[PDB]
Assembly symmetry: C2
Homo-oligomer: 293 residues x 2
Amino acid sequence: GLDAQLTLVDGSTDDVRVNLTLTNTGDKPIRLLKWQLPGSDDAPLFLVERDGQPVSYEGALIKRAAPTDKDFQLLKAGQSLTVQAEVSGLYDMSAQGQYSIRYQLPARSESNAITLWVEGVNDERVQAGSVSFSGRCTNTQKSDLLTALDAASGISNNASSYLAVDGQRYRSWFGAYSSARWDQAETNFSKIKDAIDNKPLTFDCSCKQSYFAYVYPDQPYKVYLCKSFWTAPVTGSDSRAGTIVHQLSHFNVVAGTDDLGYGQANARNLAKTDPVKALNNADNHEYFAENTP
Amino acid sequence: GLDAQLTLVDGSTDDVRVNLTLTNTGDKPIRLLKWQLPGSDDAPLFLVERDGQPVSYEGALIKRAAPTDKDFQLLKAGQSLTVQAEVSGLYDMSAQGQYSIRYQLPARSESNAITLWVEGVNDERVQAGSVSFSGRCTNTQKSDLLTALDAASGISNNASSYLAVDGQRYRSWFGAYSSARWDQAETNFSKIKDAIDNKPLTFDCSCKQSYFAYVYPDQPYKVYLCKSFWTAPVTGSDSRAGTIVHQLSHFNVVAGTDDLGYGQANARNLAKTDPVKALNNADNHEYFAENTP
Ligand SMILES: [Zn+2]
Ligand SMILES: [Zn+2]
């Protein structure tokens, strides 16, 4: 027969990783549908409950045709296959509480349940402004993102306060003074602040490219984080907080900023060279907010 | 110096491919910022105008740090590099008319302009219901998708009409009759029809996986098409039209269908075995609408 044993992995992030051992206890090989083994494609393979109530599935749903021979994994007689899954990135395990997790048996009926207390992401934005996730953001990621968002709120309020008392910081990132350009920058930060505070934001963690993040400017307010987001400091230069300000600025409904080159020296040269371009550049907005130093 | 020559590629799809030749005409190697050469990462590298007016950039915007040595491409003295780009997937070239396209010179100022008449995607949905795109859908793709959408509308109206006169087709895909389950199916198709007709749909062409499509059920109404969408027939079994019905059915605001296995035999067994599961399965909805035969 087919035996499925789930065990919790011990670690010190807030992620919820599990080891699933599937074992052919019979005497002839069996075939397991690969789409129903945990892996890089999303499917709802687990029953996740908090305090006896099902939580949301948070992954994608795929159309696949009927499977063919190539779609099945062979397990020999006696043989075990162990696969690890991170569960918090595919089910909503954001609320604190006692959870049970079982795996459903793949096509050729459940593992044991495991149970654990989950600290959760203790934030009203995840339970006007809200924050949702996709692309397998784990509890640690979600928590890191909310942290980054509060930091971003801190620097976007600080930018906005600076701009409300109508100037080196402005000079550095936006160039020679004009009231029209200052009012424009102030309007941009007002809208960035209003998105941080009040809009339905979405962060996605699927991107593995080496840069920081990307958005589609006509698809508010979903920000895709990439590898350099995670390696960046929460605050300071080219920081997580600053990245959020950068990316939010691109949305057509926020500030419609452009990509007019990349980096601090680029940004400084724009300011010195062509204030109108600086006013239209995401980086200049980020660096004005980061104000580091 | 650096010379940039753009030429149009002749072909018989509606895509707009161009060959960009960059040439170091000087005597020492030069370095070209790779991020500003056309490639797999989106940036707005071209000036695209229709009838002398700029059209929208339709690609993503990325945060990158200042570039380092590794980010520059070397071009030797005398040397040319030719790179091809498809332009309709990154700028809005959906309206019929006369277009000019120039490339902006990368960091180390424009190519010649090329001009061409573009047939466009001649559809009010792209100019209540609308259709937007991301993930580099070309004019041919956009046109194929609108075609598929009209086909999907055809089969979703036909499903809805069938369900309005209150039964083999129902039996095949939804199992034994009950008024509650029939009303539920009718409500599901009413909402699928209303999304096809009246909602802001988004199709994305970036996915290269071998299956048909995927959605996030909490991210309406963006459908990601994958390789099997393009190889599928427009109508019939496992068709483009049917895929759209499948995927739209998954959205929480449409019909909240599940992924309860994959394929026609799966679907038929659900119906025979467990009508409540069939009523909750995307495929059963697709196959009921495809009704092939
Ligand atoms: Zn599906
Ligand atoms: Zn950017």
